[PDB]
Design a protein around this ligand. Sequence first.
Ligand code: CA
Ligand code: CA
Ligand code: CA
Ligand code: CA
Ligand code: CA
Ligand code: CA
Ligand code: MN3
Ligand code: MN3
Ligand code: MN3
Ligand code: MN3
Ligand code: MN3
Ligand code: MN3
Ligand code: MN3
Ligand code: MN3
Ligand code: MN3
Ligand code: MN3
Ligand code: MN3
Ligand code: MN3
Ligand code: NA
Ligand code: NA
Ligand code: O
Ligand code: O
Ligand code: O
Ligand code: O
Ligand code: O
Ligand code: O
Lengths: 266, 266, 266, 266, 266, 266
Amino acid sequence: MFKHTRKLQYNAKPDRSDPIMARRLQESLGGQWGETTGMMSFLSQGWASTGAEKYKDLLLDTGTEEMAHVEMISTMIGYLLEDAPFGPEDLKRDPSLATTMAGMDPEHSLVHGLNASLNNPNGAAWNAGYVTSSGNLVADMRFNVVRESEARLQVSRLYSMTEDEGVRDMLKFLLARETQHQLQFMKAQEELEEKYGIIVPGDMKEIEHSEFSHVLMNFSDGDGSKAFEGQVAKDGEKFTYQENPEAMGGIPHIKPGDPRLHNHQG
Amino acid sequence: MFKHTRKLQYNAKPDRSDPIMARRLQESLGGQWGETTGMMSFLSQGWASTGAEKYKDLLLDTGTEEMAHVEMISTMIGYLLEDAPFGPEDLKRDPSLATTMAGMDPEHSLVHGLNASLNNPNGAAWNAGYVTSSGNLVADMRFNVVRESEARLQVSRLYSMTEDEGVRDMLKFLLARETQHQLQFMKAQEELEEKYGIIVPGDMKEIEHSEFSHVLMNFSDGDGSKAFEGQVAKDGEKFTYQENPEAMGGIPHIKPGDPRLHNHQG
Amino acid sequence: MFKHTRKLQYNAKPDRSDPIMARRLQESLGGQWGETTGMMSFLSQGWASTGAEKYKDLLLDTGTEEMAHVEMISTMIGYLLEDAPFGPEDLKRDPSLATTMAGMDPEHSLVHGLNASLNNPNGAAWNAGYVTSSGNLVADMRFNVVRESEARLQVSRLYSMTEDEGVRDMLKFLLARETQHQLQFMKAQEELEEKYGIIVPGDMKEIEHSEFSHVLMNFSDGDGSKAFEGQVAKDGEKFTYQENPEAMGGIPHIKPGDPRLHNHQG
Amino acid sequence: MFKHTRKLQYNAKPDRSDPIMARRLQESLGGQWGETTGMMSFLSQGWASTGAEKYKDLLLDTGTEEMAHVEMISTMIGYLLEDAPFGPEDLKRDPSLATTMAGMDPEHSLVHGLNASLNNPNGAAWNAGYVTSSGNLVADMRFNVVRESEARLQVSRLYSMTEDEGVRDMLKFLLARETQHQLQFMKAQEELEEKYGIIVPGDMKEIEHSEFSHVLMNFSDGDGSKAFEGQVAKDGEKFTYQENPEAMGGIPHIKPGDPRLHNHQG
Amino acid sequence: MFKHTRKLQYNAKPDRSDPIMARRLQESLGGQWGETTGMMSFLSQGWASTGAEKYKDLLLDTGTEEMAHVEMISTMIGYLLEDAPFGPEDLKRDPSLATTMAGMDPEHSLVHGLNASLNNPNGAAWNAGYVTSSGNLVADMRFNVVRESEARLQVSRLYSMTEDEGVRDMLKFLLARETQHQLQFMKAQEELEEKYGIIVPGDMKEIEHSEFSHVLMNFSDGDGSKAFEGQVAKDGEKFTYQENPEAMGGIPHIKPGDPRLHNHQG
Amino acid sequence: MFKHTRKLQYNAKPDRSDPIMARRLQESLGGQWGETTGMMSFLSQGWASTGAEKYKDLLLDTGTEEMAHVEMISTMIGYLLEDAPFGPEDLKRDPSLATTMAGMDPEHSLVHGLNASLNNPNGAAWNAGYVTSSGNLVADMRFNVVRESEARLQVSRLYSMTEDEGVRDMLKFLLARETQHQLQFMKAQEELEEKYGIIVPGDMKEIEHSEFSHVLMNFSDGDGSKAFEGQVAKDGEKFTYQENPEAMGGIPHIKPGDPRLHNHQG
Ligand SMILES: [Ca+2]
Ligand SMILES: [Ca+2]
Ligand SMILES: [Ca+2]
Ligand SMILES: [Ca+2]
Ligand SMILES: [Ca+2]
Ligand SMILES: [Ca+2]
Ligand SMILES: [Mn+3]
Ligand SMILES: [Mn+3]
Ligand SMILES: [Mn+3]
Ligand SMILES: [Mn+3]
Ligand SMILES: [Mn+3]
Ligand SMILES: [Mn+3]
Ligand SMILES: [Mn+3]
Ligand SMILES: [Mn+3]
Ligand SMILES: [Mn+3]
Ligand SMILES: [Mn+3]
Ligand SMILES: [Mn+3]
Ligand SMILES: [Mn+3]
Ligand code: NA
Ligand code: NA
Ligand SMILES: [O]
Ligand SMILES: [O]
Ligand SMILES: [O]
Ligand SMILES: [O]
Ligand SMILES: [O]
Ligand SMILES: [O]
């Protein structure tokens, strides 16, 4: 179960309004790699785990934290939308606001009354297709590192998309929390790799066709990738290199379907 | 530019038909972590890179290979759908086929004439929201490892969802290629981390609020995560642990909107 | 069955072109609470009803009217897009048009030839996820009131997003029709509530766990909601108030899955 | 900010496994009117409100409670998926399990390792298009009543879709909470209607074309809706009835577009 | 404007219930090439046209007819869902119904109360991405023929998916209407091609790089397409054939981006 | 299987940067009728064909070619995004860039690091709902002609949306290839129509209700469509015309559902 305090985890107030930045920050709220993705991924993985409490609790700790970040971004967006222009009265006051209006999300005003959406900057709804919870935490801890890496990349970009020190203060906090989250998930990932194996899943080495497991296949005519040849892979075996990959599976010949399908193909 | 040969990269023919397995394999064709996701992610990242040829070429090599896998899965599904039941004539032949029909994707027959879709097993269309190309390859190589990890997990599951040795032959090849792909992307990842930093992006350490960068914050009441306390993180600094995270940001108070918005909130 | 007349239900011509307003009006055409949502919701509900003709006919009447509104908005958008700028030749005759171009939907010209789309202002396609038809008209009449409420709110906002008297004339008609629709659906709702109950569905009072049915649970630390304590709810029973809700369900412990799933969780 | 306890708000454990019921319950987790919709709608409205604390706090209290329900449904699904059949070895044990397998969501096993998804029963991802936060709480409290009405309908149906008394115990709790939520939102709605008006928004009566505001227009040839004629609407004015609605707007003619668009229309 | 009669265009009543067929028929209601696609495509194109009345009226005629077909399919689905099984009481009545339940759409009962949805058989929502209205009727009449072709193919398949004579009666009517619609759109198409050109758009022959306009480029190693070599194309010019297409564009190199983007690519 | 060369099929470098044009060109990369739609449609149809080699090879040839076009558009977008403005430093340098920034896709910088997305200009993800592969090549070749027609229309429009002769050079090549593709698919279509019939599918004429197969039904009150009366349709039979279409199916009456559904409809 959860409980809520009205107090934010950390400052989420800008020095001044900026509806263009509000639109950008929709990426962090409703985007592919945003806080809602973190929240739902870590919570769902956490609820699904039947294994080590170290990792189950880490996931629930972090997913709960991400809910605080969802709250923070939603709040920042609301502040940033204060006094945003949306109609003729605004243009009469200052005709240059047309530029601002053009760069805004039309739905911020029209749909939400100058409040945050749960979409990205382009109005694409957040969706669960952004979430991963597979049941395998070697894989999912890798995913969690990625989530925090792509997110911190975006936050770092956002930092260079404003000069507002209030917005930056919030971003600087999130950068630090994303460092922590990257690191904690990397530690979990490494412990899980040590237990189960470096290849995911770790218990299929005897099943796969081993002859092809360490061959770098040169499908594009650049030769940059030849530099991997002879390097030691993370499992201790060297990469080999195949200059000209071969087509080994023959030409397929699927059977024409039943006439009731009307598959008229010549 | 690309060229195509009709010969498959590797065998993609089953020993017998099975439209239920065809439906499962749609995950590998049109699903979140399937071959189309790999193909489009690695190619888009490859085309976007302005950096080291070692990695640009690796991405284009692999994206091109994934197109061969898309072809293989599409082919396997077509073979698996041969003679699949879809109407009363089939039930006249064998009434027990109603069970098979119930488990099939209705659109395999109706929409596609007993051929593959570009959807997942539940008819959800593949979409570009599954794809990541961020411009940062430290982040994106991590993503690529994840893609290959989730895919290999799914392929491993699929192996236990059939007894068809022809299907399994294809799966065993893909398991191996996914091993190679996981490993090559891990090597690239590690080299990029060595160059730019273990935290993504690596050039923000002096900007983030460092005091919060290594603190494990206990938001859920389990104590499993306390095991991380005092462990050395990948950047060489130890994690600290906060049993009771603090709300430091105050209670927000956003300015009510302009009356033209009709934001009647009491 | 339907028949069509080329005459619009009401005026839908703007006094002047304005492609930015065209973009805003896409909300009323292809948006979540737009006219297409009303049309499809009321017709689907109407076709699904097996109950009182008073309500079935109301739904079909209204859904049919909403098709006229879809036609009007589509028409208005087309007029608003007349002579809109879309390339270098336009800027040559008026360089100030760059600002207009920046705020336009690129697809209005490129995809549709300066005609309406069936997307919202952000380009997100209308979809049936916006539509409700549940089989229960106590629930669905409530939905219908909401549809007309959200729509009228948006129309009211649009009224303040233009000074075009032609656009406003159409909007003033839509405001009035949305008043009628809100009121007719409110009357239907109330009659249905009188027949079936104020709680939806009205025939489960003896099944639910009654002890929790009138308790306001204070999950957020604000005390505003305490003002509901002792107030008489619509079913005639007072609300009680629980300042500190309790977790009553225990800590779950789901069983680890079969090894074939490779659920490596530590 | 939020905090989490591992203890569930209320029991969420079935007496027996049942992966078909697991699939149904996905509606309550990832569906249109499910607990995630509640959680995100109430939290987003709550964060966006600048109005009376009575309602802002109510929203935050309830959105936080709905997170507990998301947790419960996710947990219930996990339990229900225990030991579910997913491959040939299950059929070897009991060939009759083919029926169960046919009815399952293939991704429960393949994608999630026999854990919950964030999709509906058909694998359609939850998305933010299900959420409303408009800025107007007269409209949005109506929405919230709908949310809880449609949800309670679905929970009532679910009660008749199982005989598992553990599942039913959870459902009975949710029915009761949905009663409370329906009622509290209805009270809020009524107080806000008193303050602002029964028509949303309540401050446009002088703007709308009043002649059309209380006319029931008979667009479908059934005569059931004529029963509204003469009834007193909720604003105190009687409905009138128009048996034969008229097309008042003329036949529109948009100008042909610029030749650079190539709008060849004959 | 539109008016509605309760009378269906043509019979849409089955002899018997069949919830599996109901699910199939959702393709015709909510699917990619179904009646809602026809309705919205032909109406949107019709409203958009500024050209010949012959075609504008044809589009509005047919779009209006498609609304009748949306009504028919919606109705047929409702009838087909009568008495459909959805819970333990049905299995007590007839345990063999488990098979039927497994093949049904879970949301038909749970969400819609055994009524139609506006989704396809897999629960994917109808969306406007299925609609085309481009402003060019040479293109769009081609699209309209495709819509009616794909639809008639599906209806033909549906005919072999049931033996119900009532269902078949409806299908036989739809087949015939789809014949008419294919033909009328083909005639419009041809007239428009005669006016504007066989290539769309017809007024760019002097702009394109003509040298590459009639060359069949053999990008895949099969030789079947060489049969086009020397055949006369529809514009009266012969196809030529290139066995080995050439890459003429060079190897691109984009400039590395601003460091504020953190594009760390090696 | 596929192989790749770094060399582009044809020039894809603009003379100069233009991030607004980059946004437009996203229609050709990730849009409904763009190159990814061609690529995936032609390849999937190719892989699914069991019919004449002429057509199967054509589809594989062309789908492979479209992959080169995907590469080209991706590359062109990357070049066009060079030096695009994205933050305060750019505005400090040149305040006039705010107009450009307002018209850009915010995600070009924030998500992709000034590289291409796989979305349309409005950020809507490319999805497989854009792709058709039905199993019937009479229908699908019609679809392929449409794809190339809509694409060539958009490319033609793009030509008038820039003065950059580098961009135009690429567009001029694509116009020519779209001519060839339109023509080759038209030729295939015509051969297939001669083999199977002009109506799709061609083997249903004795099943359909022939009395309705050549009647133009006047559902909209314009009389432009009466011009088709007496014209000879493509199958050799004249169209007839019905001024007043009749509703022949009666008023439906579906049975009220089981009480366990709670279908309270009055
Ligand atoms: Ca290479
Ligand atoms: Ca903890
Ligand atoms: Ca409270
Ligand atoms: Ca009526
Ligand atoms: Ca060839
Ligand atoms: Ca007519
Ligand atoms: Mn965060
Ligand atoms: Mn984080
Ligand atoms: Mn692969
Ligand atoms: Mn791979
Ligand atoms: Mn309306
Ligand atoms: Mn209305
Ligand atoms: Mn709840
Ligand atoms: Mn609730
Ligand atoms: Mn039709
Ligand atoms: Mn038709
Ligand atoms: Mn092309
Ligand atoms: Mn082409
Ligand atoms: Na505000
Ligand atoms: Na019924
Ligand atoms: O975070
Ligand atoms: O792979
Ligand atoms: O309306
Ligand atoms: O709830
Ligand atoms: O049709
Ligand atoms: O093309």
